[PDB]
DNA sequence: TATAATGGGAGCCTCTGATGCA
DNA sequence: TGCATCAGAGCCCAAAAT
């Protein structure tokens, strides 16, 4: 929803943002026809 | 150490103008231009040439150079002559020189005081293929255009007029410089329209549009073929230094063969063809081998007309065609027997 | 005709054919880049009396060391239902060799 | 003759211009429609040579009978296309520019010669500070401006354009 | 690479091996006729199919690239003879 | 994470579109260009390490 | 801070002119200036102002540095530095040594120090920075072309800003941008942020990068090369071999020795000639 | 070609050598 | 004059890279 804080006018709409890749049943992706895996990354935990 | 930060700091050293200060500089600039017109009339001298001499003396000795349109080379000798000619004017005429000088001075100041305006407009155009400083400099160019065209009488503040010209300058720069393969500004406009259109269609259709759907949305004159051709023309090159792999070890260009330079096999083959051709031409008479060499360009590289080969051997244009035909006839006969030249026909 | 034996009407190798290195998988012609034939070719063409063709053989062949039985072919042209290729591409052929 | 030695030396602007077969006056590369090189651009055949052997761009002179000829119409020499690997162009700068190797390689060669530190050479080259060639009798803060002195922007303007202030 | 119909890389360490063996002509072949010497590699192929022995190699094209790349860096690289006179490895093509 | 990045770029475009054009007639469809988001996700899946 | 010099009649100087104490201002020489300064001719107040200031020559950038380098007398500087080599302090002698070594370098070589500043910038031949159509009809091009393009654009703009009498702030910005652009072409990342193509974090590849490093011209193409008449395969033990032998697969051997094989196939009658022989092995 | 608009944005090893401070 | 601090210099090969 777009709002004009001065006027109060409100126009609301559902906008299309493109596509997001879906994971298949086995935990992989199909990207341009080829099956891909996203490998987990170990790193330093945030904190003090 | 940071060129943007430095420029911003330099920008911050010229105070912004009061409405009064702005009108004063704008007023002096307009008046200075009217003065240059008058000096042209009085002297019968080029107004542009006059403007460069006036401008040369205001900016100082630092900047003195030839201007592409001026007929005379602009150097201290010539600018002294013309400046001395202007100072040789009567008082009521010589006053316009003083007016013009102060006009150029005010032009400088007016430009300098508005530089932060260009920055605030340019920052919005980043990411379109021009660097921030580049956008600032083209934007500055528009600011200069605005100062020359500004009419202070209209009572509009300067920022209003400048903003149009600055936006214009930045957009022209992006249209002119952003592509390795340069595209005419109008064609860039057409390409961008097609982008917006396709984006509208994808925003209403929930998927990328086909070529035909884009063609409807573009109206008459547009079919699917033209949408495709326009997109083809709009393709930007990709770097030869584009990485292959997750190591830094290889480039995309390393995988691209060279089709221009002949391969060893091709060079060898062409050489063998020349040697077999000479072998077949030795089985003719020297004259009928020479007629063919002269007619097909093997000698000197050019193909001679029958009139030229005939005049060179002392025979008639019909005669040289005849000795050429019997040469070629003998050539065809020897080939069917020995089959030497067949394999080079691929 | 020995070279073209296993190609169908459209130029794609037939399903079930055995392909070996050097064999044509998909036949293709490309228009010759404009060039002036060397005087050797001028003389050769003149000797044999055969026009140099406008097109060259760009056909896809089995690379060295590869080959097998053709189990599938996919052909996608431009202007046929459901398929749109990247700009400039008239048609795409895929040959699956097992 | 046989190559026994390889010399490497600095190149004068004159020598760089003698190498050059033309000045590249335009950022253009190749024409978006014809795909032929753009005149005066980075790929120009009039500068770096013909794309095709013994054939000019427009195609008036197509064979080796002309070698060394420069087509009046298209401006291209008829020679081997191999020359596009060899022939150099040049860009004529509006302001001299320092060659960074002689700046950033420590100790700087330019800096060492002129007795300028790394910071000073940086400040002049990248336009943070002025350097005085001719004081022309200037004096700043009671002491005379000495040649090769570095001035800030504030210092230079007060010297060059004078000091003033405006009070609201 | 195999997919490009590529040649094997005879790298820095392979060159050391040929050097330690003192195989100067084998090494020179690797550096010229079997690689970027254009005139040389053409001549070698033609010689072998004709039964002649392979000709003396010429300047490797990547050395010409190096010279021109250093000229692009404003350094003048000059090949000299024993008399310290210039030798033109571009064979007149790049000089006016 | 890459989604968040593409979203930040899309937001830059929104603020930039909220200055230009008519300050009166604007919808969300006119304000949003989704290309930055699509690109961030497309970049992650194809070219990420 | 300026001096005011009123005038009744015509003024012989004009606004913007630079002036020294004593320079004639107006009235045929009657009124003249007491200070060093810049002339401001006031037509309202009927007065010639002279703002106290000097004609000082002070410059920025490579133009200034090139000048100081042009004015170097290296012979003279050698003499001074030899005298410095006698000074008791080790550091004094050390600094004079390093300086003197650069001086002597230029002296023996015959190189002028000002050549380290560029006026004409060389442009590499196009085939070494190609624009090529790849397989799909798409174009692929070397990064140097974008680096040259940045350079050319800024230079041309500099010529235009100069012709139009832009303020010093604008001309200065362009000049520092011009220095930075030459820097990027020659060694990118060397000074400042590496210039990159849009929508990529990848530094463009400059001449220094092409020359140096593991991927550079020296180590990649000069001290090692890919070669013809070569092959590779998996190895397997051959106990039956004599020490001077190896097993070589015939299909490999046919390729490795292919030209020789073409010649031999001609001597024996297997093919009419080399061209036919090659076509038969294909 | 004219309401006015006036200062940006991202950020995370070892050895060697010169340089700037006790 | 003697000592930190920092900038800039390096960090295996070939194969492959779908
Ligand atoms: Mg490797
Ligand atoms: Zn021509």
UniProtKB/Swiss-Prot annotation, chain C:
Domain of life (superkingdom): Bacteria
Purpose of the protein: DNA-dependent RNA polymerase catalyzes the transcription of DNA into RNA using the four ribonucleoside triphosphates as substrates.
Section covered of the full-length record: 731 to 828 of 1119
Protein name: DNA-directed RNA polymerase subunit beta
Disulfide bond sites: none
Family indicated by similarity: Belongs to the RNA polymerase beta chain family.
Subunit record text: The RNAP catalytic core consists of 2 alpha, 1 beta, 1 beta' and 1 omega subunit. When a sigma factor is associated with the core the holoenzyme is formed, which can initiate transcription.
Curated annotation (Swiss-Prot), chain G:
Domain of life of the source: Bacteria
Cystines in this chain: none
Primary role: DNA-dependent RNA polymerase catalyzes the transcription of DNA into RNA using the four ribonucleoside triphosphates as substrates.
The family this protein is said to belong to: Belongs to the RNA polymerase beta' chain family.
Known partners and oligomeric status: The RNAP catalytic core consists of 2 alpha, 1 beta, 1 beta' and 1 omega subunit. When a sigma factor is associated with the core the holoenzyme is formed, which can initiate transcription.
Protein name: DNA-directed RNA polymerase subunit beta'
Organism, as annotated: Thermus thermophilus (strain ATCC 27634 / DSM 579 / HB8)
Gene from which the chain derives: rpoC
């Amino acid at each position: 929803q777009l709002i004009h804080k001065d006027t109060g006018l409100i126009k609301e709409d559902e906008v299309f943002l493109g596509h997001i890749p879906l994971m298949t049943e086995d935990g992989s992706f199909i990207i341009n026809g080829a099956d891909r895996v996203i490998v987990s990354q170990i790193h330093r935990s945030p904190g003090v | 150490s940071d060129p943007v930060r430095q420029y911003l700091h330099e920008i911050g050293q010229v105070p912004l103008l009061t409405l009064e200060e702005e009108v004063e500089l704008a007023r002096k600039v307009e008046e200075g231009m009217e003065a240059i017109k008058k000096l042209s009339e009085i002297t019968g001298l080029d107004p542009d040439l006059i403007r460069e001499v006036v401008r040369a003396k205001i900016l100082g000795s630092a900047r003195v150079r030839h201007i592409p349109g001026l007929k005379e080379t602009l150097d201290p000798k010539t600018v002294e002559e013309i400046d001395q000619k202007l100072k040789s004017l009567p008082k009521e005429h010589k006053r316009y020189l003083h007016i013009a000088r102060e006009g150029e001075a005010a032009r400088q100041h007016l430009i300098e005081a508005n530089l932060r305006l260009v920055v605030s407009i340019a920052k919005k155009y980043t990411g379109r293929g021009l660097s921030f400083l580049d956008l600032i400099q083209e934007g500055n160019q528009g600011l200069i255009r605005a100062v020359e065209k500004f009419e202070y009488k209209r009572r509009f503040k300067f920022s209003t007029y400048a903003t149009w010209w600055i936006r214009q300058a930045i957009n022209r720069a992006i249209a002119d410089q952003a592509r390795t393969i340069r595209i005419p500004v109008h064609m860039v406009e057409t390409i961008n329209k097609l982008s917006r259109t396709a984006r509208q269609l994808q925003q209403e259709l929930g998927r990328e549009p086909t070529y035909e759907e884009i063609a409807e949305a573009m109206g008459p004159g547009w079919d699917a073929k033209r949408v495709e051709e326009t997109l083809k023309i709009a393709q930007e090159p990709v770097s030869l230094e584009t990485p292959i792999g997750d190591e830094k070890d290889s480039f995309y260009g390393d995988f691209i063969p060279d089709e221009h330079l002949p391969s060893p096999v091709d060079a060898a083959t062409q050489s063998l063809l020349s040697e077999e051709l000479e072998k077949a031409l030795s089985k003719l008479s020297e004259r009928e081998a020479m007629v063919l060499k002269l007619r097909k360009g093997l000698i000197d590289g050019r193909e001679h007309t029958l009139e030229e080969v005939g005049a060179f051997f002392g025979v008639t244009r019909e005669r040289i065609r005849q000795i050429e035909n019997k040469a070629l006839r003998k050539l065809k006969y020897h080939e069917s027997r020995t089959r030497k030249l067949r394999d080079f026909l691929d | 005709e020995a070279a073209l034996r296993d190609l169908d009407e459209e130029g794609v190798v037939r399903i079930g054919a055995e392909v070996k290195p050097g064999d044509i998988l998909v036949g293709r012609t490309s228009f010759k880049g404009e060039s002036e034939p060397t005087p050797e070719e001028r003389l050769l063409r003149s000797i044999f009396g055969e026009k140099a063709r406008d097109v060259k053989d760009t056909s896809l062949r089995v690379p060295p060391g590869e080959g097998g039985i053709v189990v599938r072919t996919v052909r996608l042209r431009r202007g046929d239902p459901g398929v749109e290729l990247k700009p400039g591409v008239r048609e795409v052929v895929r040959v699956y060799v097992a | 003759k046989e190559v026994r030695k390889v010399r490497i030396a600095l190149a004068s602007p004159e020598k760089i211009r003698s190498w050059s077969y033309g000045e590249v006056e335009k950022p253009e590369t190749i024409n978006y429609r014809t795909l032929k090189p753009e005149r005066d651009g980075l790929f120009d055949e009039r500068i770096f040579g013909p794309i095709k052997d013994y054939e000019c761009a427009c195609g008036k002179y197509k064979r080796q009978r002309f070698e060394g000829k420069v087509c009046e119409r298209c401006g291209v020499e008829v020679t081997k296309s191999i020359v596009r690997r060899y022939r150099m162009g040049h860009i004529e700068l509006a302001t001299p520019a320092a060659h960074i190797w002689f700046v950033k390689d420590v100790p700087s060669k330019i800096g060492t010669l002129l007795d300028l530190s790394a910071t000073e050479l940086e400040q002049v080259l990248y336009f943070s500070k002025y350097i005085v060639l001719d004081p022309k009798g200037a004096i700043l803060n009671g002491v005379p401006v000495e040649k090769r002195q570095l001035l800030t922007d504030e210092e230079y303007r007060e010297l060059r354009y004078g000091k003033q202030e405006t009070y609201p | 690479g195999k997919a490009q119909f590529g040649g094997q890389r005879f790298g820095e360490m392979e060159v050391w091996a040929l050097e330690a063996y003192g195989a100067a002509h084998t090494l020179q072949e690797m550096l010229t006729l079997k690689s970027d010497d254009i005139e040389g590699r053409n001549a070698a192929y033609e010689a072998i199919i004709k039964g002649e022995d392979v000709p003396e190699p010429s300047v490797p094209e990547s050395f010409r690239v190096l010279v021109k790349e250093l000229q692009a860096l404003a350094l003048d690289v000059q090949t000299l003879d024993e008399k310290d006179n210039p030798v033109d490895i571009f064979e007149g093509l790049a000089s006016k | 994470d890459q989604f968040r990045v593409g979203l930040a770029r899309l937001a830059r475009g929104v603020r930039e579109r909220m200055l230009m054009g008519s300050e009166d007639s604007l919808t969300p469809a006119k304000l949003v260009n989704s290309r930055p988001l699509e690109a961030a996700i497309r970049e992650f899946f194809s070219r990420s390490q | 801070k300026a001096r005011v010099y009123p005038f009744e009649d015509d003024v012989e100087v004009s606004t913007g002119d630079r002036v020294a104490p004593g320079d004639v201002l107006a009235d045929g020489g009657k009124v003249k200036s007491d200070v060093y300064g810049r002339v401001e001719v006031d037509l309202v107040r009927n007065v010639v102002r002279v703002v106290e200031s000097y004609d000082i020559d002070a410059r920025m950038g490579a133009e200034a540095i090139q000048q100081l380098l042009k004015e170097l007398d290296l012979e003279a500087l050698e003499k001074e530095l030899l005298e410095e080599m006698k000074h008791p302090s080790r550091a004094r002698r050390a600094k004079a040594r390093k300086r003197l070594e650069v001086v002597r370098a230029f002296l023996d070589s015959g190189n002028r120090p000002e050549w380290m500043i560029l006026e004409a910038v060389p442009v590499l031949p196009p085939d070494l920075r190609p624009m090529v159509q790849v397989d799909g009809g798409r174009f692929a091009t070397s990064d140097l072309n974008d680096l040259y393009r940045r350079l050319i654009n800024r230079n041309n703009r500099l010529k235009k800003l100069l012709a139009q009498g832009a303020p010093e702030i604008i001309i200065r910005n362009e000049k520092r941008m011009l220095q930075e652009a030459v820097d990027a072409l020659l060694d990118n990342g060397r000074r400042g942020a590496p210039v990159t193509n849009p929508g990529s974090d990848r530094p463009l590849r400059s001449l220094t990068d092409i020359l140096s490093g593991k991927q550079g011209r020296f180590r990649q193409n000069l001290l090692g090369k890919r070669v013809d008449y070569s092959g590779r395969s998996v190895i397997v033990v051959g106990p039956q071999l004599k020490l001077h032998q190896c097993g070589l697969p015939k299909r490999m051997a046919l390729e490795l020795f292919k030209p020789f094989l073409l010649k031999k196939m001609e001597e024996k009658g297997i093919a009419p000639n080399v061209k036919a022989a090659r076509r038969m092995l294909e």
